[PDB]
Structure formats: structure tokens, C-alpha cells
Coordinates of C-alpha atoms and ligand atoms in Angstrom, one line a residue:
Chain A
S234 CA -13.2 0.0 -32.0
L235 CA -15.7 2.1 -30.7
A236 CA -13.2 3.6 -28.0
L237 CA -11.6 5.6 -30.8
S238 CA -14.9 7.1 -31.8
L239 CA -16.2 8.0 -28.2
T240 CA -16.2 11.6 -27.2
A241 CA -14.2 13.0 -24.2
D242 CA -17.5 13.2 -22.0
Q243 CA -18.5 9.6 -23.4
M244 CA -15.1 8.4 -22.4
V245 CA -15.7 9.9 -18.9
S246 CA -19.2 8.6 -18.5
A247 CA -18.1 5.1 -19.6
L248 CA -15.2 4.9 -17.0
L249 CA -17.4 6.6 -14.1
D250 CA -20.1 3.9 -14.8
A251 CA -17.5 1.3 -15.0
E252 CA -16.3 1.9 -11.5
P253 CA -16.2 -0.9 -9.2
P254 CA -17.8 -0.8 -5.5
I255 CA -16.1 -0.2 -2.4
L256 CA -16.2 -3.5 -0.9
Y257 CA -16.1 -4.2 2.9
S258 CA -13.9 -6.4 5.0
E259 CA -14.8 -8.8 7.3
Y260 CA -16.4 -7.3 10.6
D261 CA -15.4 -7.6 14.1
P262 CA -13.9 -4.3 15.5
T263 CA -11.0 -6.2 16.7
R264 CA -7.9 -4.0 15.8
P265 CA -5.5 -6.2 13.7
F266 CA -1.9 -5.9 15.6
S267 CA -0.9 -9.7 14.4
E268 CA 0.7 -10.2 11.1
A269 CA -1.6 -13.1 10.2
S270 CA -4.9 -11.5 11.0
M271 CA -3.7 -8.4 9.3
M272 CA -2.7 -10.2 5.9
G273 CA -5.6 -12.4 6.2
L274 CA -7.9 -9.4 6.2
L275 CA -6.5 -7.7 3.2
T276 CA -5.8 -10.8 1.2
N277 CA -9.7 -11.6 1.7
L278 CA -10.4 -8.1 0.5
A279 CA -8.0 -8.1 -2.4
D280 CA -9.3 -11.5 -3.6
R281 CA -12.7 -10.1 -3.7
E282 CA -11.9 -6.8 -5.4
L283 CA -10.1 -8.9 -8.0
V284 CA -13.5 -10.2 -9.3
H285 CA -14.7 -6.8 -9.6
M286 CA -11.7 -5.3 -11.3
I287 CA -11.9 -8.0 -14.1
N288 CA -15.3 -6.9 -14.9
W289 CA -14.3 -3.6 -14.4
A290 CA -11.6 -4.0 -17.0
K291 CA -14.0 -5.5 -19.5
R292 CA -16.2 -2.2 -19.4
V293 CA -12.9 -0.1 -20.1
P294 CA -13.0 1.4 -23.7
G295 CA -10.7 -0.5 -26.0
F296 CA -10.1 -3.4 -23.5
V297 CA -12.6 -5.8 -25.1
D298 CA -10.9 -5.1 -28.6
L299 CA -7.8 -6.9 -27.4
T300 CA -7.3 -10.8 -27.5
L301 CA -7.9 -12.9 -24.4
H302 CA -4.4 -13.6 -23.8
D303 CA -3.6 -9.7 -24.0
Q304 CA -6.6 -9.0 -21.5
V305 CA -4.9 -11.8 -19.4
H306 CA -1.3 -10.2 -19.4
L307 CA -2.4 -6.8 -19.0
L308 CA -4.2 -7.6 -15.7
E309 CA -1.5 -9.8 -14.6
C310 CA 0.9 -6.9 -14.9
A311 CA -1.3 -4.0 -13.2
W312 CA -3.7 -5.8 -10.9
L313 CA -1.8 -4.5 -7.8
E314 CA -0.9 -1.1 -9.1
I315 CA -4.9 -0.8 -9.9
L316 CA -5.7 -2.2 -6.3
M317 CA -3.1 0.6 -4.8
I318 CA -4.5 3.5 -6.7
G319 CA -7.8 2.9 -5.6
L320 CA -6.8 2.5 -1.9
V321 CA -4.6 5.7 -2.3
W322 CA -7.9 7.4 -3.6
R323 CA -9.9 6.2 -1.0
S324 CA -7.5 7.2 1.7
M325 CA -7.5 10.8 0.5
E326 CA -10.1 12.5 3.0
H327 CA -8.1 10.5 5.9
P328 CA -4.5 12.0 6.0
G329 CA -2.2 9.5 7.7
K330 CA -4.5 6.8 7.3
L331 CA -5.1 4.2 4.7
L332 CA -8.8 3.2 4.0
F333 CA -8.8 -0.1 2.7
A334 CA -12.5 -0.6 3.6
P335 CA -14.9 1.5 5.1
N336 CA -14.8 -0.4 8.2
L337 CA -11.0 -1.1 7.9
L338 CA -9.0 2.0 8.7
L339 CA -5.2 1.5 9.3
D340 CA -2.3 3.9 10.4
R341 CA 1.4 3.6 10.1
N342 CA 1.7 2.0 13.8
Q343 CA 0.0 -1.3 11.8
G344 CA 3.3 -2.0 10.1
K345 CA 3.8 -5.6 10.6
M346 CA 5.9 -3.5 5.4
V347 CA 6.0 0.1 6.9
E348 CA 8.0 1.3 4.1
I349 CA 5.3 0.3 1.3
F350 CA 2.7 1.8 3.9
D351 CA 4.6 5.2 4.0
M352 CA 4.7 5.4 0.3
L353 CA 1.0 4.7 0.0
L354 CA 0.2 7.6 2.5
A355 CA 2.6 9.9 0.6
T356 CA 0.9 9.1 -2.5
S357 CA -2.5 9.8 -0.9
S358 CA -1.2 13.2 0.4
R359 CA -0.2 14.0 -3.0
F360 CA -3.6 13.3 -4.5
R361 CA -5.2 15.2 -1.7
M362 CA -2.9 18.4 -2.2
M363 CA -3.6 18.3 -6.1
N364 CA -7.4 17.9 -5.5
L365 CA -7.6 14.9 -7.6
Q366 CA -11.1 14.7 -9.0
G367 CA -13.0 11.4 -9.6
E368 CA -13.0 11.9 -13.4
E369 CA -9.2 12.1 -13.2
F370 CA -9.0 9.0 -11.0
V371 CA -10.9 6.8 -13.3
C372 CA -8.5 8.0 -16.2
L373 CA -5.3 7.3 -14.7
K374 CA -6.6 3.9 -13.5
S375 CA -7.5 3.1 -17.0
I376 CA -3.8 4.2 -18.2
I377 CA -2.5 1.9 -15.6
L378 CA -4.3 -0.8 -17.0
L379 CA -3.3 -0.4 -20.5
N380 CA 0.2 0.9 -20.1
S381 CA 1.7 -1.3 -17.5
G382 CA 1.9 -4.6 -19.7
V383 CA 2.0 -2.8 -23.1
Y384 CA 5.1 -5.0 -24.1
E385 CA -2.0 -4.8 -32.5
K386 CA 0.3 -2.7 -30.1
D387 CA -0.7 0.5 -31.9
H388 CA -4.6 0.0 -30.4
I389 CA -3.4 0.6 -26.9
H390 CA -1.3 3.5 -27.8
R391 CA -4.4 4.9 -29.7
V392 CA -6.5 4.4 -26.6
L393 CA -3.6 5.7 -24.5
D394 CA -4.0 8.9 -26.5
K395 CA -7.6 9.0 -26.1
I396 CA -7.4 9.0 -22.3
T397 CA -4.8 11.8 -22.6
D398 CA -7.2 14.0 -24.7
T399 CA -9.7 13.1 -22.0
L400 CA -7.7 14.3 -19.1
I401 CA -6.9 17.6 -21.0
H402 CA -10.5 17.9 -21.7
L403 CA -11.4 17.7 -18.0
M404 CA -8.7 20.2 -17.0
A405 CA -10.0 22.6 -19.7
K406 CA -13.4 22.4 -18.2
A407 CA -12.2 23.1 -14.9
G408 CA -10.9 26.8 -16.2
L409 CA -7.3 25.6 -16.0
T410 CA -5.0 27.6 -18.3
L411 CA -3.0 26.3 -21.3
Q412 CA 0.1 25.8 -19.0
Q413 CA -1.8 24.7 -15.7
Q414 CA -3.1 21.5 -18.4
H415 CA 0.0 20.0 -19.5
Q416 CA 1.7 20.8 -16.0
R417 CA -1.0 18.9 -14.1
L418 CA -1.0 16.3 -16.9
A419 CA 2.6 15.8 -16.1
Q420 CA 2.3 15.7 -12.4
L421 CA -0.4 13.0 -12.6
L422 CA 1.6 10.6 -14.7
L423 CA 4.6 10.9 -12.8
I424 CA 2.7 9.5 -9.7
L425 CA 1.9 6.6 -12.0
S426 CA 5.8 5.9 -11.8
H427 CA 5.4 5.7 -7.8
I428 CA 2.4 3.5 -8.0
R429 CA 4.6 1.1 -10.2
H430 CA 7.4 1.3 -7.7
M431 CA 5.0 0.6 -4.9
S432 CA 3.5 -2.4 -6.8
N433 CA 6.9 -4.1 -7.6
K434 CA 7.8 -3.8 -4.0
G435 CA 4.5 -5.0 -2.8
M436 CA 5.0 -8.2 -5.2
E437 CA 8.0 -9.6 -3.4
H438 CA 6.4 -8.7 -0.3
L439 CA 3.7 -10.9 -1.1
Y440 CA 5.9 -13.5 -2.5
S441 CA 7.8 -13.8 0.8
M442 CA 4.4 -14.4 2.8
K443 CA 3.6 -17.0 0.3
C444 CA 6.8 -18.6 0.9
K445 CA 6.2 -18.8 4.5
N446 CA 2.3 -20.2 4.4
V447 CA 1.3 -17.5 6.6
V448 CA -2.0 -17.0 5.6
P449 CA -4.1 -19.2 2.9
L450 CA -4.3 -17.4 -0.1
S451 CA -6.8 -18.1 -2.9
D452 CA -5.9 -19.7 -6.5
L453 CA -6.8 -16.8 -8.3
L454 CA -4.5 -14.6 -6.0
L455 CA -1.7 -16.9 -6.5
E456 CA -1.9 -17.1 -10.3
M457 CA -1.9 -13.4 -10.2
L458 CA 1.3 -13.8 -8.0
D459 CA 2.8 -16.3 -9.8
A460 CA 2.6 -14.2 -13.2
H461 CA 5.1 -11.9 -11.8
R462 CA 7.8 -14.4 -11.7
Chain B
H38 CA -5.3 -23.6 -17.0
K39 CA -5.7 -20.0 -15.5
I40 CA -8.8 -19.0 -13.8
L41 CA -8.2 -15.6 -15.1
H42 CA -8.8 -17.1 -18.4
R43 CA -12.4 -18.3 -17.3
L44 CA -13.3 -15.1 -15.6
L45 CA -12.6 -12.8 -18.4
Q46 CA -15.4 -14.7 -20.3
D47 CA -18.2 -14.8 -17.9
Chain C
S40 CA 17.8 29.8 -6.9
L41 CA 19.4 29.7 -10.4
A42 CA 16.6 27.5 -11.6
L43 CA 13.0 28.3 -12.1
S44 CA 14.1 31.6 -13.4
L45 CA 15.8 29.7 -16.3
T46 CA 14.2 29.9 -19.6
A47 CA 13.1 26.9 -21.7
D48 CA 16.1 27.3 -24.1
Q49 CA 18.4 27.9 -21.2
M50 CA 17.3 24.9 -19.5
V51 CA 17.7 22.8 -22.5
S52 CA 21.3 24.0 -23.2
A53 CA 22.1 23.5 -19.5
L54 CA 21.1 19.6 -19.6
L55 CA 22.9 19.3 -23.0
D56 CA 26.4 20.5 -21.9
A57 CA 25.9 18.6 -18.7
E58 CA 25.8 15.5 -20.5
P59 CA 28.0 12.6 -19.2
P60 CA 30.4 10.9 -21.9
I61 CA 29.8 7.4 -23.3
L62 CA 32.2 5.2 -21.7
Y63 CA 34.0 2.2 -23.2
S64 CA 34.0 -1.5 -21.9
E65 CA 36.5 -4.0 -21.1
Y66 CA 35.0 -6.5 -23.9
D67 CA 37.5 -8.5 -25.8
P68 CA 36.1 -10.7 -28.8
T69 CA 38.8 -13.0 -28.3
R70 CA 37.8 -13.8 -25.1
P71 CA 35.0 -16.3 -24.0
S72 CA 29.9 -16.5 -20.7
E73 CA 27.2 -14.6 -18.5
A74 CA 29.4 -14.4 -15.5
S75 CA 32.3 -12.6 -17.3
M76 CA 29.5 -10.3 -19.1
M77 CA 28.0 -9.2 -15.9
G78 CA 31.6 -8.4 -14.6
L79 CA 31.9 -6.5 -17.5
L80 CA 28.8 -4.5 -17.1
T81 CA 29.5 -4.3 -13.3
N82 CA 32.8 -2.4 -14.1
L83 CA 31.1 -0.3 -16.8
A84 CA 28.4 0.9 -14.4
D85 CA 30.6 1.7 -11.6
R86 CA 32.7 4.0 -13.7
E87 CA 29.3 5.6 -15.2
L88 CA 28.4 6.4 -11.6
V89 CA 31.1 8.7 -11.2
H90 CA 30.0 10.6 -13.9
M91 CA 26.4 10.5 -13.1
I92 CA 27.0 12.1 -9.7
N93 CA 29.0 15.1 -11.4
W94 CA 26.0 15.4 -14.0
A95 CA 23.6 15.4 -11.2
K96 CA 25.4 18.4 -9.8
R97 CA 25.1 20.3 -13.0
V98 CA 21.2 19.4 -13.1
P99 CA 19.3 22.8 -12.3
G100 CA 17.9 22.8 -8.9
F101 CA 19.6 19.9 -7.6
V102 CA 22.5 21.4 -5.7
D103 CA 19.7 23.7 -4.1
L104 CA 18.9 20.5 -2.3
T105 CA 20.4 19.3 1.0
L106 CA 23.1 16.8 0.9
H107 CA 21.1 14.0 2.5
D108 CA 18.3 14.7 -0.3
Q109 CA 20.8 14.3 -2.9
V110 CA 22.2 11.1 -1.8
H111 CA 18.5 9.7 -1.7
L112 CA 17.4 10.8 -5.1
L113 CA 20.6 8.9 -6.8
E114 CA 20.2 6.0 -4.5
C115 CA 16.7 5.4 -5.9
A116 CA 17.2 6.4 -9.5
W117 CA 20.7 5.2 -10.3
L118 CA 19.5 2.4 -12.2
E119 CA 16.9 4.3 -13.8
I120 CA 19.2 6.8 -15.1
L121 CA 21.6 4.3 -16.3
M122 CA 18.9 2.5 -18.4
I123 CA 17.4 5.4 -20.0
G124 CA 20.8 6.2 -21.0
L125 CA 21.3 2.7 -22.2
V126 CA 18.0 2.7 -24.1
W127 CA 19.0 6.1 -25.8
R128 CA 22.1 4.8 -27.0
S129 CA 20.7 1.5 -28.5
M130 CA 17.9 3.7 -30.1
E131 CA 19.7 3.2 -33.6
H132 CA 20.7 -0.4 -33.0
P133 CA 17.5 -2.5 -33.6
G134 CA 17.4 -5.9 -31.6
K135 CA 20.6 -5.0 -29.8
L136 CA 21.8 -2.9 -26.7
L137 CA 24.5 -0.7 -27.0
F138 CA 26.1 -0.6 -23.4
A139 CA 29.2 0.6 -25.0
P140 CA 30.8 1.7 -28.5
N141 CA 32.8 -1.8 -28.3
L142 CA 30.0 -3.7 -26.3
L143 CA 27.1 -4.3 -28.7
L144 CA 24.9 -7.2 -27.6
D145 CA 21.7 -8.8 -28.4
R146 CA 19.2 -11.0 -26.7
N147 CA 21.5 -14.3 -27.6
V148 CA 20.3 -16.7 -17.6
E149 CA 16.5 -16.5 -17.8
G150 CA 14.8 -13.4 -16.0
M151 CA 17.8 -11.4 -17.2
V152 CA 16.5 -11.9 -20.8
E153 CA 13.1 -10.6 -20.0
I154 CA 14.7 -7.3 -18.7
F155 CA 16.7 -7.2 -21.8
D156 CA 13.6 -7.2 -24.2
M157 CA 11.9 -4.7 -22.0
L158 CA 14.9 -2.6 -22.6
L159 CA 14.7 -3.4 -26.5
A160 CA 11.0 -2.7 -26.5
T161 CA 11.7 0.8 -24.8
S162 CA 14.4 1.3 -27.4
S163 CA 12.3 0.6 -30.1
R164 CA 9.8 2.7 -28.7
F165 CA 11.9 5.6 -28.6
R166 CA 13.0 5.1 -32.2
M167 CA 9.5 5.1 -33.4
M168 CA 8.7 8.1 -31.7
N169 CA 11.8 9.8 -33.0
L170 CA 12.9 10.7 -29.6
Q171 CA 15.2 14.1 -29.5
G172 CA 18.1 14.6 -27.4
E173 CA 16.4 17.7 -26.0
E174 CA 13.6 15.6 -25.0
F175 CA 16.1 13.0 -23.4
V176 CA 18.0 15.2 -21.5
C177 CA 14.6 16.5 -19.9
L178 CA 13.4 13.0 -19.6
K179 CA 16.6 11.8 -17.8
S180 CA 16.5 14.8 -15.1
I181 CA 12.9 14.2 -14.3
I182 CA 13.8 10.7 -13.2
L183 CA 16.4 12.2 -11.1
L184 CA 14.2 14.5 -9.3
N185 CA 10.7 12.6 -9.4
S186 CA 11.8 8.9 -8.8
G187 CA 12.7 9.8 -5.0
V188 CA 10.7 12.9 -4.4
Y189 CA 8.5 10.5 -2.2
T190 CA 9.9 8.1 0.4
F191 CA 11.7 11.1 1.9
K192 CA 10.5 18.8 10.4
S193 CA 8.7 21.0 8.0
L194 CA 11.5 20.4 6.0
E195 CA 10.4 20.6 2.6
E196 CA 11.0 21.7 -0.3
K197 CA 10.1 18.5 -1.9
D198 CA 8.2 21.7 -3.0
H199 CA 11.1 23.2 -4.7
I200 CA 11.7 19.7 -6.8
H201 CA 8.1 20.2 -7.7
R202 CA 8.9 23.4 -8.7
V203 CA 11.7 22.4 -10.9
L204 CA 9.7 19.4 -12.4
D205 CA 7.0 21.8 -13.8
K206 CA 9.8 23.8 -15.4
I207 CA 11.2 20.9 -17.1
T208 CA 7.4 19.9 -18.3
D209 CA 7.4 23.4 -19.5
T210 CA 10.7 23.0 -21.3
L211 CA 9.3 19.8 -23.0
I212 CA 6.1 21.5 -24.2
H213 CA 8.4 24.1 -25.7
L214 CA 10.4 21.6 -27.9
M215 CA 7.5 20.2 -29.0
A216 CA 5.8 23.4 -29.9
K217 CA 9.0 24.3 -32.2
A218 CA 8.8 20.8 -33.7
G219 CA 5.6 22.1 -35.3
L220 CA 3.4 19.8 -33.3
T221 CA -0.1 20.7 -32.9
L222 CA -1.4 21.7 -29.4
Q223 CA -3.0 18.3 -29.1
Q224 CA -0.1 16.4 -30.3
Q225 CA 2.0 18.1 -27.7
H226 CA -0.2 16.9 -24.6
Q227 CA -0.2 13.4 -26.4
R228 CA 3.7 13.1 -26.9
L229 CA 4.1 14.5 -23.3
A230 CA 2.0 11.9 -21.9
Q231 CA 3.8 9.2 -24.2
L232 CA 7.3 10.1 -22.9
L233 CA 6.2 10.2 -19.3
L234 CA 4.2 6.8 -19.4
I235 CA 7.7 5.3 -20.5
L236 CA 9.1 6.3 -17.2
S237 CA 6.8 4.1 -15.5
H238 CA 8.4 1.1 -17.7
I239 CA 12.1 2.6 -16.8
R240 CA 11.1 2.3 -13.1
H241 CA 9.7 -1.3 -13.6
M242 CA 12.8 -2.4 -15.3
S243 CA 15.0 -0.9 -12.8
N244 CA 13.1 -2.7 -9.9
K245 CA 13.4 -5.9 -11.3
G246 CA 17.1 -5.1 -12.2
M247 CA 17.7 -4.5 -8.4
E248 CA 16.5 -7.8 -7.5
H249 CA 18.5 -9.4 -10.1
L250 CA 21.6 -7.6 -8.9
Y251 CA 20.9 -8.3 -5.1
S252 CA 20.7 -12.0 -5.9
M253 CA 24.1 -11.9 -8.0
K254 CA 25.7 -10.3 -4.8
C255 CA 24.2 -12.9 -2.5
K256 CA 26.1 -15.4 -4.7
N257 CA 29.4 -14.0 -5.3
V258 CA 30.8 -14.7 -8.9
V259 CA 30.7 -11.6 -10.2
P260 CA 31.8 -9.0 -7.7
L261 CA 30.4 -5.4 -7.2
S262 CA 32.5 -2.4 -6.4
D263 CA 32.3 -0.5 -3.1
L264 CA 30.2 2.4 -4.4
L265 CA 27.8 0.0 -6.5
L266 CA 27.4 -2.2 -3.4
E267 CA 26.1 0.9 -1.3
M268 CA 23.8 2.0 -3.8
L269 CA 22.2 -1.8 -4.2
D270 CA 21.8 -1.7 0.0
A271 CA 19.8 1.5 -0.5
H272 CA 16.9 -0.7 -2.1
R273 CA 17.1 -3.1 0.8
Chain D
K17 CA 29.1 6.7 2.4
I18 CA 30.9 7.1 -1.0
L19 CA 27.9 8.8 -2.6
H20 CA 27.6 11.2 0.2
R21 CA 31.4 11.8 -0.3
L22 CA 31.5 12.3 -3.9
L23 CA 28.5 14.5 -3.8
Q24 CA 30.1 16.6 -1.0
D25 CA 33.5 17.2 -3.1
Ligands
5K5_629 O1 -3.1 -10.6 -0.8 C1 -3.0 -9.3 -0.8 C2 -2.9 -8.6 -2.0 C3 -3.0 -7.2 -2.0 C4 -3.0 -6.6 -0.9 C5 -3.0 -5.1 -0.8 C6 -1.5 -4.7 -0.3 C7 -0.1 -5.4 -0.6 C8 0.7 -5.5 0.6 C9 0.5 -4.3 1.6 C10 2.0 -3.6 1.9 C11 1.8 -2.4 2.8 C12 0.5 -2.0 3.3 C13 -0.6 -2.0 2.2 C14 -0.4 -3.0 1.1 C15 -1.7 -3.3 0.2 C16 -4.1 -4.4 -0.8 C17 -3.8 -3.2 -1.5 C18 -4.7 -2.5 -1.7 C19 -6.1 -3.0 -1.5 O2 -7.1 -2.2 -1.6 C20 -6.3 -4.4 -1.0 C21 -5.0 -5.0 -0.7 C22 -2.9 -7.4 0.1 C23 -2.8 -8.6 0.5
5K5_630 O1 24.6 1.8 -18.8 C1 24.2 0.7 -18.2 C2 25.1 -0.3 -17.7 C3 24.8 -1.4 -16.8 C4 23.5 -1.5 -16.6 C5 23.3 -2.6 -15.9 C6 22.0 -3.5 -16.3 C7 21.4 -3.3 -17.6 C8 21.5 -4.6 -18.5 C9 20.9 -5.5 -17.5 C10 20.6 -7.0 -18.3 C11 20.5 -8.0 -17.3 C12 20.1 -8.0 -16.0 C13 20.6 -6.8 -15.3 C14 21.6 -5.7 -16.3 C15 21.5 -4.4 -15.6 C16 24.1 -3.0 -15.0 C17 24.6 -4.4 -15.1 C18 25.3 -4.8 -14.2 C19 25.6 -4.0 -13.0 O2 26.4 -4.6 -12.0 C20 24.9 -2.7 -12.7 C21 23.9 -2.5 -13.7 C22 22.4 -0.7 -17.1 C23 22.7 0.5 -18.0

């Protein structure tokens, strides 16, 4: 596994270069106030993002070393967390708003869940107040990928330790003191517990709309959704 | 029979 | 505030002597099912909640919060605190979950078995890391303060909770440093401990929806307090 | 609520 032999900077550059693009939603400036048009716009976006996520996961150090079934399981567990932490990241510069796409900016009044919506905004505000850097973001997202479905197993724990070293290395380069390092390290990882929470509540929210035939979901998105049952 | 199986090989 | 001005050793000792007792169940080896089991666990959890509430009051900085805040933090993390306690108790019983000193169960209704295995994996995870009691009482306190710091005018401290969470983090590092762990090992172990909290969150969320379906089907009844805790996640 | 009661007592 070349991931363990990588340096902290080599780890960063690998994760940064593996970054999936910021996709656009279907245009037409009609502000979605319906439940069908809303989810139809988000389902189409998420489905296209899933394709980039899969190829992004392959370029994550240590992920390719796993078996195919392990790669499947890990992606099945964390695909919504990864989508959400990406959404939250994009929504940083827009307080009280969620930037699903550059041409799709939604606020709390578009709730038609609002509870999960507010949790996403709170997470976005938290990242903004902590001044989350891009190098820190790609490390957290990688952790989510490897940690969420970690239940051979040592390898994932070794890479997770490697990302931890990478996170600390970034903070030390930012001039952070010894105490500010492990503190910020703790603050970043505790948010991952909330991302997990929003994901679980999101899943059952997606099971209900699937159990209502509201919007035609894709087969891929259905299989990802079916895995959490 | 998963699509995720195919996409992880492409 | 009594907190924040507390040293790391003062923090540890305060969390240790605030520990709730390990209660017994109503299990009878002679008596026969999955229904009676959940009834035994429901009765156990209900009695554990009373001790958890008084335990939370002795958590540094918790009583500094408003009453409506304290309610929210417990409503969101009561199952998480219960689970990490269960996992901690079952640490020395491989393949078994120690719900009570008289109730030690193994994997032998689907969905509940998946949660059972996730609880075992976490218990196995604590065992391979050689988790200390001083580390556990810190982790459990973090769960109490962190799990509901979001989902809460100008308000706020939320900001005090973040201040206390930093203190507990400093405390965790102080413990690892006293354990002879190198500066690198301290950061890795810290990350390892907090990543487990994401799993505890997950198991809690799946536990709630299982508890919600059990409610909307009668059979095993829930106590009045346990019912109001459950409605908080709906 | 009961939780609100016990926390207050
Ligand atoms: O089929 C879907 C799969 C995922 C999404 C998605 C969600 C899930 C549900 C809603 C809940 C409240 C508001 C935002 C989230 C995002 C989401 C999240 C982040 C993205 O970047 C894209 C889609 C929506 C539909
Ligand atoms: O010390 C503890 C006591 C009880 C619980 C608790 C659990 C844990 C075990 C899992 C196993 C199957 C599915 C749900 C239960 C929930 C539980 C069970 C039944 C209830 O009515 C409430 C909580 C967790 C920790």
C-alpha cells in the first residue's frame, strides 16, 4: 500500500487533485416551491454527483487496496455523508443558504425536511466560524469514506491514522500551537458525528419519498438507498 | 447484481 | 463558572466520582423470547435514565446551561450515552453484551442483530485500544455536550459548551501524555476515540427507529419517561 | 415533561 509511504504533503496533493467537480443543476430560473420539483432537481444532481464520487473514491489513498466488496460497502455507507459535507462546504460563503449548485441556491423557506435543512446550515456556519481550509476539507471527507463502514481492518485504521497525521501537519504549517492543534483536531472530528446524524435522518427521509413514488429515482440511487435497509 | 460493482471497475 | 478553571486532573476526578452505578436486570434463567427481552431492556434503560440525569448534573459546565438546553442535550444523546456505557461494560466479554451483571447476552428479530453486531464491534474496538476509564468518562461527557450542540435571540453559549468541549479534549491529551504516548500517538488515539463517537451516533439513530416501530406495535410497552425521550426524535 | 421535571428537582 503506497498510501502509508506517502508524505503529509503527498497525501494533501493526492486528495486535492482527486476532488470531484462542482456540478450544475438543470437550469431554468424557476424557483422550486413544489415538493416534486424540489426533490426532482436534487435527485438529478445527487445522481450525477454519485458518478464523480465513485471515481473520486478510487483516487483516495488506500481505498484501491481494499477488496471490491469492501469498496462497495464503504461507499454504500457514506455516500450521503460525503454529499452533505460537500454541500456544507460549498455553502460556507453563503450564510443561511445552501449551495447545492452554483445555479441552485436554496434557503430555509424552501422546506417542503426543514429540520435537516437547518442542521446543514448550522454545520455550514460552524465550518465558516472555524475557517475550514480546503486541505482540511478533503481530509475530513476521506475520513468519512473510510470510517463510516469500517465494521484487513487494520489497513483502514492505518490510513485513518495517516490522515490524522496529515491534519495535524496542516495545522502546524498554519502556525497553530501544540494545544490549538489537538483542539481543532477534536472540533473537526466531532462535526463528523453530526454529519452522520444528518445522513441517517436524510436516509429515512429518502425512503419515504421512495415509498410514495414522488420523483422517479435512478436505479443507482435506488441501490444506494436500498443498501441502508 | 449491483451497479456499484460495475462502476468501481470502470 | 466552576468549569474551564478546572485542571485536567480535577476534570478526571470529577467525572469519575460522578459515575452512575451498574444496575441489575429482572432476568430469570428459568423463565423463557425477543419480546420479553426488550421488556427487560426497556425496564433496565428506564431505570438507567434516572441515574443519567443526575449524572449529567455533575458534568462540569452542564448546570451552567439553561434548563431548556439541558433537556435538549439529554433528549438527543440519551441512547448514545446508554450505548457507550453498554459497550464499555461489555469490553471484557468478547462476543457478548453486558447489559447487566445478571444479563449477559450473545448474538443468538433481524435488524436488531445488526445493531447488536455493531455494538460488539465497538466493544471489540475499545478492547484492542485498551480504553481507560478516565478516557471513557471523557468520551461519555463529550457525547452529552456535543450530540445536541447543534439543532438548538443571541442566546448562546452554545459557546460555553464549545469551551468545555475544548477542556475535555485537553484532558484527554493530558491522560495520553501521562500514559507515555508520544506526541504523534496522542493525536492518533484522540482521533481514534472521536471517530468511534460517529459509530455510536449511527447505532443510536438506528436504535431509535427500531424503538419507534416497537412503540407503534405495542407488545413491549415503554415507560412514561422513555416515551417522551423517544418522541424527541420524531 | 418528566425530563424537565427531574432536571429541575
Ligand atoms: O435523491 C437525493 C439524494 C440526496 C439528496 C440530497 C439531500 C438529501 C435530502 C435533503 C434533506 C433536506 C435538504 C437537503 C438534503 C440533501 C443532496 C444532498 C447534497 C447534495 O449535494 C445533493 C443532494 C437529495 C435527493
Ligand atoms: O444500557 C443500555 C440499556 C438498553 C439499551 C437499549 C438498546 C441496546 C441494545 C439494542 C439491541 C437491539 C435493538 C435495540 C436495543 C437498544 C435499549 C433497549 C430497549 C429500550 O427500550 C431502550 C434502550 C442500551 C444500553
